[PDB]
Design a protein around this nucleic acid. Structure first.
Ligand SMILES: [Ca+2]
Ligand SMILES: [Ca+2]
Ligand SMILES: [Ca+2]
Ligand SMILES: [Ca+2]
Ligand SMILES: [Zn+2]
Ligand SMILES: [Zn+2]
Lengths: 615, 351, 615, 352
DNA sequence: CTGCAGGGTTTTTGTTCCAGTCTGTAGCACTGTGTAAGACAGGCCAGATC
DNA sequence: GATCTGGCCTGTCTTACACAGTGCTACAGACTGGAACAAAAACCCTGCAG
């Protein structure tokens, strides 16, 4: 008969060897002839490919990790990244940490104190530097961390209150933090571009983008208004040593997305009151002005290397732009921000313009206003000085906005439709309710054709589903005359033709065909407006019209993009700020923003997002 | 000696903690509008009128012969007496601007024409300064004197930002009293000159002055460096010993310690005063009446009008002078929520 | 020629299968010929031998623990424990997870959907059971889960509308879930008592404690009520002379981590209608449940269960509102005796327990029918304060927390009266009352450093009854006699506070219990001697409670600190924190989320994964 | 015509509950039924009503010694017993649903006994037992009195109820089903009770209004839950009290009306005008309804509806009762956060 | 010898289809929150007026 | 020489609206096989190139 067959994994390893000696020696001689006797790797690959037969990837991946080295512990860096990236507050961390730690026998996470120790390498204040020449009226330190913003108001009762609350850094140390962070990426640009290392020590140029926006009435059950002033690295090119008009090394690839907008200052103040805003932002301005002259020295990759700067101040909505620039607010006679036209001198001539507006000449105009060396009259002085009223203080390249960039254009097309329902050049005096009747019939028409329920005000999505040759033809169904229909078709066709040019990121790379052909297209546009629709723009024009027909090509030639400076991006980070406050309150206002900024600036570094693989 | 509340009807969000007031030819003019002027009012000078206990406001304007003025915050005010050659005026210098830079440029403000329909015209001749010019500084004081017999002007007080050699951008909003050297101002030529005396051991701020017949008397103030609120009431005597602007000074014993004063004269040289604060936590509450003659100043305390409790427990307050024993004060009005009218007004008067 | 063949550990799995095809089919034929056609165990044993022949024993032992023993990281159960025990959201959890796996392979945590499947093991509706005998007027179902709380209310607007948002469990299923949870501990208890397992399957005994009191201002309607219960103790009765063996006794019942939520409703505790209209089904459950024997397969053996209930943890206001007695502080106060208000002043201490729930019913029938034709208040006397119909049998006890806070506010106003010389001046002023308020306010602000609130919490009381704080307060009232008097009062109070705070006073302080009668007696004689000015005939409720009834209560019950209501009002903080960071959020769903989370938050099969692997 | 006026209650906003009733005893008007069990302020629950200078005031009522106290029912039935031999003047109430949502199923004969002194009223009750063969517990029905040459009795019909006690289920413990179409002929002395079936009573229903005269009764519109519909038919029974079997017959009318949870107003002996309740499950009726009746027949025609305010024509629901003799009280559930806490504005309507 | 064009070689890697299987993510229903576009009132200035 | 109203201008509520956060779910795309195949990497190896 014989001994009954037992399952091989229940017998001792001696009986397993007895019953598997045949296959053991077979695989031995097979490995000798095929792979040079590498028995362990061959039996590993066979065990794996047998595991995947039953679609059981999991345990095979686990054991694969048990092989080719080990990853028992977690890099403290990634661990701090995982506390921040998820808004986990301190004690929350400590709790989950104790849990997992004494769960299974190994220190998978790192604990608090070592986390914070390793973290202190990432805030401002950790990489010494010189400055050539030494800075103009600037502190000498390089470890000075989070300075309170108040900037030493003697708490004296007599004067303007010192109750305002503020926390920030020193601009320079912030810049050096961001750069010393980005060492990995700059060395990647070096390895890609195939450029020397001993001959890349001087000719750098970093473009740094400023931005400031108000932020209203932080909602908390239990200290409402807020202002956040931040910057963002944009590009770094080479300049050594021949012609090299420009060789970019690291161009940011998600310009606006709040993942890259490093906060620098925060103040429980209101967007409105010029006073306290300047009273804090002064130091920042002083540094900025003082910095652009000198050049910067920093060790990166062992070689101390040089850095210059140019600044593109863009990130503001028009109110802030008038404020810093000194022009009225807002629906003024000096409607533009680059030309000087009123409404009218933009109405007769629309696009045949030239940008001249500049900072130091605004200073000049202001001095002229104050002294009035020609002793002319009030409105005389206003017009002869081009609407400057107040001594501005901060250089801002007053660029067009990308975020709206349409909403005036939207509501303008909306009104135009409502009027082409009507007959304006036959009845140039419509009444109160007839325009409403026409609007309602237009809206019901659209609702029946393009599924766009009526609105009160123009969001983006509304406009984007509006500006369609399809919606054009659908609304044309309503206008009677077979003639003006095709006219506005030509109109909206040109407008569609030109939209992406300004909402682009790099038309010099994206779609240069319209860019090169743009100016003539804008000309045809203005022609159609003045010829077929003069009834409405005799002397008054919408704000954004001046921009969108004025300087878009000239601005792009000045810079080379539009969206790559829109503060629309910063408007995201408000979601961050508010939640951070809701989930990492201290909470006394003195340390409230202290920790807010600490955690925020932590959130916004490359170093950690690189550990956000999800790959 | 009584108070009565007022009502900030509208235009209330345009009065800020510090400001100034000027009485001239009836109409009183507010100065120091928060933020740069609007197209609502180009100049910034507002005309104020008051009826049945209302606080209403109207805008003003200038001629072409005039310069346009920045809305300074805490300047020094000085009344030019009405006589030859060009009466009458009020002098301002130099305060801090809505941007925290500083003027170092006095202005000579006057009224020009009226009405026809109750309307007013002004001009503003900035007077260029040769010297030895004063450096920009605020909270300080100025005064006018008419010394046998030509008239000139005297400056004193003031803090600033540290000289731009240790101007330190972490402290870039500190203050420290300027070295107390008086300056003498002739109208024309603007022969500005510095002087001092050893009795001027240290200089103060927020100290209201008072002058008559070229013998000026300085009132209570404060000094940061020593953190005291000294009582050093001072007298000083000047005269034009051309070609020498000879000066003499002397300390006097009795000097009250009252900061951020509110000066409303009534008599020829009689001044009933409120005073902002007693100590940099505890405000002053009691009034003060001040005589003075060729013998000298003589003190007295009149009756304090009955402050409502709401002002009594304020954290801060200030005010200005509406003229003729009557004046205007203000409260940072704590409301939950803000109205956003942060300033109720109670009116004060004499007898 | 030929391309050089690289090491086997670098090739792709398609190229690896093509390289190994020969030995792959050879291993297939060897497994099929000799090992019963199972290649997986064959290659497992082969990799085992190729490792163990290399003396790299750690890696092979870890592999052998991974197979047939659940390695695969740490656990699904511990994972859910972490995910709940620190409030991490679902997006939060997944973001942490895909990161912590992305870098550092060998995934530790588990994805979401595996926790979706895991949760089905701890909610209600999973472990089968039945009743012996079957249950009257309760459904035959057992696999149901979270039930819509209305019990299926007819929506017809004619009747009362279904205006309420409420979800709950099926009380019986909640019970069986909690019991099958306590299986680990009951098995260890059968161990420790040296008791058999296959035998003694008949005399199990469970006691259940249940409480309910909501909170105000849940907003930004607005109120809520929370009815929850907690397994208290469990013992065994077999088989005769043996009075019983306590198997498990809850070691920390007063704290949060044992308060299983069972119903929640957006109702006020005031409008007595919607309250019963919801809580009805629970009433039917309780009633029909007192008798039948419960049967669960715990520890492999389906064993009998009985049930005694002890309804305790309602704060006094509701205890009235559920006993239909006059509301609330009228001449009838003692919830346990027939005593008047004054008959508690003439005699304070000598009273017998009379209140019998079923006699409350049978006397409410006497109220209604009035067999003796008595007038209104004569009948109020003849029934001894019984007005409404009793609705829920509450065991005649009291709470610890609200009783001690009432003592705290009583001594608070005793200070606010002794600061006035009221024993000479019998009628103080209201404004002088407020000024005595302010002077005692600055008094306790100077020493012991506590703040003013208009309504009081627990720490205020526990640090408010101490002797050196009394001497910090005695330093105002001028007398030398009254100070020593009420300091003797504070001392005698400390002779008795932990007597009712006792967990088992026959252990913690039998000296303070056996002398309790004499302590209360000296208390009463002092009130009659030196403080009779205040307690001529007007007494407070909690005072009578703590003075005359404590001894018989503990003598019959076993403790008072046991059945206390600490957990409820304290964990409504946790309710709030839940609705904050875990809601859906939408009305009909806020609960069906909150309840799942709450009942999850409180299972031993999790709490052990915080303490058991902490020490 | 008919007219409305906005009222306001001074010191009462928490006694009136979504359901209540109204009663006239000897020209004197009494509210009934409060939210929450009796407070110490009034151990009865009955309240004197008053409407003056736009203000709504209230007061407490009392009882005798032989007067058993009454639990605060919410939606009972009502029928004025006509003042006659021997004992005027009863006002029967039964049996509604209780605060603890049970059903009392108890007949309470309520009347006035003495007065005053100063506008003061003294009441009594006799919770009468039912010998039978009694009607079961239920609610939402209505009943009325009849006289058959010349015997006098009182009869009920309708109502909903909880599920039967056997099939009752803890997850359905609050749903309700309509009653079986069996009418109960209620003697008062003695308190005998007898149930009767009607073969043409196609189904039970609820929430109907009805009135009787000279031994013949007409039943108006309510609701049937079988189809979730609201029949607009009308029914009529011709019944008398023959010794000793009170033989009874009933039959259908061609067309009645579609109303639910109405407001019954009297003007005269049998001339009534109704203020309407609800048309359908979400659309309430708005118009009046005059109904003449006699031994020739019921004669019916609409009336002119007043001009409602914005709120009542835009609120979700309303309810109320009649102060008697063409005078009435209604209520609107208010909307407010903060609660005023007046959740109920008050209007009064009348005739001519 | 170099030089490249490209012939051989084995070895990556995709390559096609049908039945499963896991999982990562987008879509859905949902009311709290900031908002800025617009209705507006109400005040002021010039025009017609007293 | 002083008063009254339409046009209009500018600060002010207010209200539609996006949009963000959270569980839940559904679906789609990566994962299993046998043959049979271009197309390329880089060793080699010839063969026409001086
Ligand atoms: Ca903004
Ligand atoms: Ca913004
Ligand atoms: Ca409570
Ligand atoms: Ca409470
Ligand atoms: Zn321009
Ligand atoms: Zn008692």
């Amino acid at each position: 008969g014989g001994r009954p067959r037992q399952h091989l994994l229940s017998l001792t390893r001696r009986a397993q060897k007895h019953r598997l000696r045949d296959l053991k020696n077979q695989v031995k001689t097979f490995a000798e002839k095929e792979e040079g006797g590498d028995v362990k790797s061959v039996c590993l690959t066979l065990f794996l490919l047998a595991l995947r037969a039953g679609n059981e990837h999991k345990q095979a991946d686990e054991l694969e990790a048990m092989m080719q080295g080990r990853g028992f512990g977690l890099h403290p860096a990634v661990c701090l990244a995982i506390r921040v990236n998820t808004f986990l507050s301190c004690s929350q961390y400590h709790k989950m940490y104790r849990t997992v730690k004494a769960t299974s026998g190994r220190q998978i996470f790192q604990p608090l104190h070592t986390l914070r120790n390793a973290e202190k390498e990432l805030l401002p204040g950790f990489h010494q530097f010189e400055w050539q020449p030494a800075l103009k009226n600037v502190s000498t330190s390089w470890d000075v961390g989070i300075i309170d913003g108040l900037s030493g108001w003697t708490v004296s009762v007599d004067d303007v209150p010192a109750d305002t609350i503020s926390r920030r850094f020193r601009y320079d140390v912030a810049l050096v933090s961001a750069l010393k962070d980005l060492e990995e990426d700059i060395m990647e640009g070096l390895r890609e571009r195939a450029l020397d290392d001993s001959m890349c020590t001087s000719g750098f140029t970093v473009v740094v983008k400023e931005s400031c926006d108000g932020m209203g009435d932080v909602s908390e059950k239990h200290p409402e208004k807020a202002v956040r002033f931040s910057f963002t690295i944009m590009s770094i090119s080479i300049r050594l040593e021949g012609e090299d008009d420009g060789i970019t090394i690291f161009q940011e690839q998600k310009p606006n997305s709040e993942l890259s907008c490093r906060p620098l200052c925060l103040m429980f103040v209101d967007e409105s009151d010029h006073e306290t805003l300047t009273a804090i932002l002064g130091p920042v301005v002083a540094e900025r002005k003082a910095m652009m002259e000198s050049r910067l020295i920093i060790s990166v990759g062992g070689l101390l290397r040089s850095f210059r700067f140019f600044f593109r101040g863009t990130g503001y909505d028009e109110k802030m732009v008038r404020e810093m620039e000194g022009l009225e607010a807002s629906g003024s006679t000096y409607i533009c921000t680059l030309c000087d036209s009123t409404r009218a001198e933009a109405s007769q001539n629309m696009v045949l313009h030239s940008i001249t507006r500049s900072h130091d000449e605004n200073l000049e105009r202001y001095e002229i206003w104050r002294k009035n060396p020609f002793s002319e009259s009030a409105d005389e002085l206003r017009d002869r000085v081009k609407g400057v009223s107040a001594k501005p203080f901060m250089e801002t390249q007053p660029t067009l906005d990308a975020l709206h960039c349409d909403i005036g254009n939207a509501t303008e097309f909306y009104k135009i439709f409502q009027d082409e329902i009507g007959e304006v050049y036959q009845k140039p005096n419509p009444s109160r309710e007839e325009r409403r009747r026409w609007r309602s019939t237009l809206d019901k028409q659209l609702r029946k054709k393009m599924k766009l329920k009526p609105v009160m005000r123009m969001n983006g999505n509304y406009a984007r589903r509006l500006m369609t040759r399809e919606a054009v033809e659908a609304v044309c169904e309503l206008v009677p005359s077979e003639e003006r229909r095709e006219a506005l078709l030509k109109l909206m066709d040109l407008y569609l033709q030109m939209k992406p040019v300004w909402r682009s990121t790099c038309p010099s790379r994206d779609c240069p065909d319209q860019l090169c052909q743009y100016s003539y297209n804008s000309q045809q546009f203005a022609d159609l407006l003045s010829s077929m629709f003069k009834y409405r723009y005799d002397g008054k024009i919408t704000n954004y019209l001046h921009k969108t027909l004025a300087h878009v090509p000239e601005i792009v030639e000045r810079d080379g993009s539009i969206g790559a400076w829109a503060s629309e991006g910063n408007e995201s980070g408000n979601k961050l700020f508010r939640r951070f406050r809701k989930m990492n309150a201290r909470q006394s206002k003195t340390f409230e923003l202290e920790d807010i900024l600490k955690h925020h600036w932590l959130y916004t570094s490359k170093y950690l997002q690189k550990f956000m693989e999800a790959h | 000696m009584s108070l009565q509340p007022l009502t900030a009807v509208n235009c209330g969000s345009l009065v800020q903690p510090g400001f100034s007031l000027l009485d001239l030819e009836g109409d009183v003019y507010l100065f120091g509008q928060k933020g740069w002027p609007k197209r609502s009012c180009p100049t910034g000078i507002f005309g104020v009128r008051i009826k049945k206990g209302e606080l209403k406001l109207r805008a003003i304007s200038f001629s072409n012969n005039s310069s346009y003025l920045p809305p300074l915050r805490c300047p020094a005010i000085a009344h030019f007496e009405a006589q030859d050659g060009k009466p009458e005026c009020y002098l301002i210098h130099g305060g801090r601007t809505p941007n925290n830079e500083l003027s170092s440029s006095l202005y000579m403000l006057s009224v020009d024409s009226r009405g026809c329909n109750r309307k007013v015209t002004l001009r503003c001749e900035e007077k260029e300064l040769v010297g030895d010019v004063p450096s920009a500084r605020y909270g300080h004081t100025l005064s006018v004197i008419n010394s046998r017999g030509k008239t000139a002007c005297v400056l004193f007080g003031g803090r600033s930002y540290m000289p731009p050699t240790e101007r330190t951008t972490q402290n870039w909003n500190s203050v420290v009293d300027c070295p107390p050297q008086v300056y003498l101002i002739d109208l024309e030529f603007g022969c500005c000159t510095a002087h001092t005396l050893p009795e001027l051991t240290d200089g103060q701020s927020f100290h209201v002055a008072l002058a008559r017949q070229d013998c000026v008397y300085f009132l209570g103030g404060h000094i940061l460096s020593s953190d005291c609120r000294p009582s050093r009431l001072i007298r000083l005597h000047v005269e034009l010993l051309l070609g020498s602007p000879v000066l003499t000074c002397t300390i006097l014993h009795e000097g009250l310690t009252i900061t951020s004063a509110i000066a409303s004269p009534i008599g020829y040289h009689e001044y009933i005063i409120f005073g902002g604060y007693q100590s940099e936590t505890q405000k002053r509450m009691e009034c003060t009446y001040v005589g003075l003659d060729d013998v000298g100043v003589h003190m007295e305390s009149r009756e304090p009008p009955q402050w409502t409790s709401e002002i009594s427990h304020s954290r801060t307050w200030f005010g200005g002078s509406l003229g003729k024993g009557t004046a205007l004060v203000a409260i940072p009005s704590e409301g939950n929520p803000t109205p956003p009218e942060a300033y109720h007004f109670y009116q004060v008067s004499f007898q």
